[PDB]
Amino acid sequence: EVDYNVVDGVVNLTGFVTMVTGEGLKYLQNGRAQFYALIVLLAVLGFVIFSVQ
Amino acid sequence: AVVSLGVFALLTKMILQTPWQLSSVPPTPDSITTIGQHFFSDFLLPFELASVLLLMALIGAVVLARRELVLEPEPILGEEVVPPLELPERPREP
Amino acid sequence: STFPWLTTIILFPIVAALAIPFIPDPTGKGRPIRWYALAVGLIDFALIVYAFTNFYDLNTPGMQLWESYDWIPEIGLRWSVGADGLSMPLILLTGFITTLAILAAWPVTLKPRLFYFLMLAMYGGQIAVFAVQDMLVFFLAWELELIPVYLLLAIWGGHKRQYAATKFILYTAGSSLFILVAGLAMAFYGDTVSFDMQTLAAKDYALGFQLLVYAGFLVAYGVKLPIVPLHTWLPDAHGEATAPVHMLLAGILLKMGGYALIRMNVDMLPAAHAKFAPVLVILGVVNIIYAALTSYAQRNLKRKIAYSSISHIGFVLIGIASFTNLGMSGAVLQMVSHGLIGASLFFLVGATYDRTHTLILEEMGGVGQKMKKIFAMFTACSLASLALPGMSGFVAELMVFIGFATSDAYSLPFRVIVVFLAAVGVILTPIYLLSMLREIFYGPENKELVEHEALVDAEPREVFIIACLLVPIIGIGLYPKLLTQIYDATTGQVIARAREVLPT
Amino acid sequence: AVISVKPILLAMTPVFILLCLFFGTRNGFYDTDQYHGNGSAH
Amino acid sequence: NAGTILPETILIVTLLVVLLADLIQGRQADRWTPYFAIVGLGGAIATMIPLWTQPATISFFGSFISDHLSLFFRGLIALSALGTILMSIRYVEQTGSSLGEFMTILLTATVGGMFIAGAQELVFIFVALETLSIASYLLTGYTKRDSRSNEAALKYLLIGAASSAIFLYGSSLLYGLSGGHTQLPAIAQALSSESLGLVVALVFVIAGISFKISAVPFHQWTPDVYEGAPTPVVAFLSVGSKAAGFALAIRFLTLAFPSVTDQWQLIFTVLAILSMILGNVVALAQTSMKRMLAYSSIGQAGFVMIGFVVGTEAGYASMLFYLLVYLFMNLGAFTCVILFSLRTGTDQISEYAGLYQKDPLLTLGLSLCLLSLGGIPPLAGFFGKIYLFWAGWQAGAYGLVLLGLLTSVISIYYYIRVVKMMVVKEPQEMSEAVRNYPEVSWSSFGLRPLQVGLVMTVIATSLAGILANPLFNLVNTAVWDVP
Amino acid sequence: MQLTYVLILAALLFCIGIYGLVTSRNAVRVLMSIELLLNAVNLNLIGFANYLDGQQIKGQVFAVFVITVAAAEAAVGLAIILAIYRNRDTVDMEKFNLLKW
């Protein structure tokens, strides 16, 4: 259980941080489409400063 | 309140510094004939498709806003039971 | 010599598997559909013999069943099959074991329509890995046995099925992408956009570019041939499997990683192979030491042989990274020997579990008093794994030991510490195998004989599969020129191509 | 001189094929007691 | 010069007869009117084949171009409504709503979309984008008494009418950054200096271009609509309304912005590395089947945007070949989602278990159209990813292919999870259909087009990557017509 | 009246409609703020057409079709407000976030 658990620790890392990111980015969708109009309009505000810089 | 003022500060940064190509041509000699010659030469295909847009916006909004008095308790059949005027994917909590 | 031979051999069990949903007479369990899989399995292997005994024409290098069709000229991928001396033993081995993997699949009456489909689709898809001389068909065929082996594990398997099959498909697909990354990297290097395996070998790649592609293929092939830091999918996906799924995984699928090491890491990438050869033989030595210690420390019998399959893999990895014509010939022989040896043990582990229903090995003991013929075949296959001479497990390991410490590529103090450490597996393999042989059959004190293991027998069909596996196991162990005659035309060219980069 | 694999693989192959077709019929324990049942590893 | 729009004006006549018969025949029309819209859509596909040989004229005073790129995307949206009608012939008849009034709203979205692909003027782009958008809100709220479908059409209206006003302010600026010039080729001749005005008019138009293709700062309508909307509309918005948004992206960002090109290739790179992440990891935590195919469509819009940021002749060809094989995967998986959602309610995963012995034609169809969405060989979605990665490595883009491959194997896990709960779950582990499956008939109303739509998409998923030598020729002709 | 003052006013109405789109809780004031955006667009579109290309006015013909779409978007839009009001007894955007875990 020595050399496996340093790569099954990676399974405990990577196979777990993929799921909890998808359970973490799930709450970006929260209903309330006024918030969806923020992220649309913050992207419009964010992509111009991405492209003049 | 800061995202809208950020948009307004962005656009006023654009509007004042952009060199606009102002044309010193005497404009609009009775611009109702120059707006209807564009409905049938240049923008003919927007003009006919805007008719299909108004039909469809009348089909759907009559459908979406009418009161179903034809047959209100009509669950027409069933494989597993579906309510009338509601999508068959029933809400369920896992 | 004008008929498409390898294209037929690849595409026959894939096409014949489409008549499997249309087989009549569903008299409860699937009996005629079991016979139909052995029908188009055996006559597909007969074509591999017929293309070999007539149109192989050995002792010459290059492909000998060459068919380069045209599939998508806009990409540049061709249906290019071809069998040289690295492909043809494993192509002959794939047709041989899968005929017996169908014949050992006879208790499988859970979903027999789905089963013999995915086993014939894994029969055409396994031959398609060794046969194709392309890149995007090689990555196609490498990922062709991805779903017909997930569904083989996740349906017909032990407990912790779904954990084993899901861990498998994520390691396999998550490392198959490096075949696509490296296979596209080589085909877009320079000015020629060719995807052929022969054209990409003759291209001249830089030494900094080759070390990326070698590390790209080594994470891709260190998973399938289990190089020991990337090995953890193997005892799970073999700890929860059946005996017919075992002989495709241990017998065939592990050899595709070893076969592709000789193709796409030695032929195509020799200059990085000169720089990444000492890391392989240390990794090959700690493949043998770790797996033999982990086999001895395990109680599950199906996982004990599963870890034992990782140990005999290590002699392939030593033999490739040795730059000797006898080291390479002991590396390809270790693929064919362990393919036949590991198929025979894993069939008998599935045969013993079908009687005792334990797989705990502390809940067993004295099984050999009840069943006598399975015990007689379990030792003859366990002694095959021990590198016991008179059988092909020895001569495959003997050529690796000799071929390593005669090579003019490493230092003498490095060659001493490898052949000393790689011969600890000569001691360590009778440790775990003979004890597991002792702790199952050798015993007066039997089990409970009530809850499980109420029955005991030994079928004549199950004797026949072990008998067919021991004829090439012993026959190469008594005359290893019955298989080296296929290699030496090609492995003579593989090492000589890698000889030009050795002064480094 | 060397014994070639082709005259002995071609000799043993019809021996091999018509034996698997025969040995499928002769079998026991997978049709009578069968406590594994429909499964293969359950 | 009205011969170049014959594929779309065959559909406007078909649009009117399926509406007038609902008034004249009055719900006895629904027994015959969907098959008239099929041959009206088949007659619109069949008139694109004689238009293929013509040498790409620009008709209607410059406001419409009938090239091969216009004709390819016109066939994708007409094939999108062709499979949608095959799905919705029973799904909205079982709802109780009128069938002829549905296909009027559904075919207006088609000729809105079929006119986006060939549009060349700023006025005609926005009118045809509104015809696709307005007809989309009516379709997602067509059932109209659900409080999920009503909240779906609400949230899609308020972002849809908002983003089409972001898109209009950019389109109004393109009228002003040039001296007039509503024509898109005449815009590119007038503006080439890459000032700050052209960047604001670029982010504004790809705020509304990427509303339809749903890249993740603008994807937020997609998962909320797709479980509230009627499932054939979900099958149309993911294929037809996405291909029209992709046809808009080529005809706008290459004809009207050939000077500013490294900017929107940098923005669509951000739109793709975020689509492949957020589409294919938030689908990984899903229970509903239409919401799992919602983040799937967002992630596999990022794969099509790999070919859009590389800007080569094989880049837009892989963008277009993957859009063709994406049609016979979301018209195949959504068919089996519907065909299961009619035989039982609650079309969500873990209610799919214990199949393959009860509904094997649904199980084989849903598996082979979900496995190819992951891109397993030798299916059609595998070859679509290969050519998107062959064209990815051909011109730089080594981090998009690696993110295209690492997110494709996260994509394998949630697609095989549905095949897990259809073939590997034992017959003692099914939740619905536990002696409850209605013993599928193929003889009732609407289920016979629903079977020929199931069968023809799996055949165009099993064989459309094997036999994709003509499809690589049919696509590479269309990329000669891009600038 | 210069060209710059029409566009600042149009960019200000576009700014006001964005504040009305995100901050407002009633579902009809969200639609009322969309009409501020589509009239912000028209003020650019006629402000440009008066000062740039005033002979063959195209932004006045384009400003016609914006009015006809916004009439069709509001008509369709209020039928969606009338559909959510028939089932949900309110028109309040904070009570339509049903799709939340």
UniProtKB/Swiss-Prot annotation, chain C:
Primary location group: membrane
EC number: 7.1.1.-
Enzymatic class: translocase
Record's subcellular location: Cellular thylakoid membrane
Protein name: NAD(P)H-quinone oxidoreductase chain 4 1
Species assigned in the record: Thermosynechococcus vestitus (strain NIES-2133 / IAM M-273 / BP-1)
Record's keyword terms, sorted: Membrane, NAD, NADP, Plastoquinone, Quinone, Thylakoid, Translocase, Transmembrane, Transmembrane helix
UniProt catalytic activity: a plastoquinone + NADH + (n+1) H(+)(in) = a plastoquinol + NAD(+) + n H(+)(out); a plastoquinone + NADPH + (n+1) H(+)(in) = a plastoquinol + NADP(+) + n H(+)(out)
Gene (UniProt): ndhD1
Keyword Transmembrane: yes
GO cellular component: plasma membrane-derived thylakoid membrane
HAMAP family xrefs: NDH1_NuoM
GO molecular function, one term: ubiquinone binding
From Swiss-Prot, chain E:
Keyword field contains Transmembrane: yes
Family annotation (Pfam families): Ndh2_N, Proton_antipo_M
Catalytic reaction equation(s): a plastoquinone + NADH + (n+1) H(+)(in) = a plastoquinol + NAD(+) + n H(+)(out); a plastoquinone + NADPH + (n+1) H(+)(in) = a plastoquinol + NADP(+) + n H(+)(out)
Subcellular localization: Cellular thylakoid membrane
Classification via InterPro entries: NADH-Q_OxRdtase_suN/2, ND/Mrp_TM, Ndh2_N
Gene Ontology CC terms, in alphabetical order: plasma membrane-derived thylakoid membrane
UniProt KW keywords: Membrane, NAD, NADP, Plastoquinone, Quinone, Thylakoid, Translocase, Transmembrane, Transmembrane helix, Transport
Main location: membrane
GO molecular function: NADH dehydrogenase (ubiquinone) activity; quinone binding
Family from the record: Belongs to the complex I subunit 2 family.
Subunit: NDH-1 can be composed of about 15 different subunits; different subcomplexes with different compositions have been identified which probably have different functions.
Function text: NDH-1 shuttles electrons from an unknown electron donor, via FMN and iron-sulfur (Fe-S) centers, to quinones in the respiratory and/or the photosynthetic chain. The immediate electron acceptor for the enzyme in this species is believed to be plastoquinone. Couples the redox reaction to proton translocation, and thus conserves the redox energy in a proton gradient. Cyanobacterial NDH-1 also plays a role in inorganic carbon-concentration.
The protein, known as: NAD(P)H-quinone oxidoreductase subunit 2
Organism: Thermosynechococcus vestitus (strain NIES-2133 / IAM M-273 / BP-1)
Gene from which this protein is expressed: ndhB
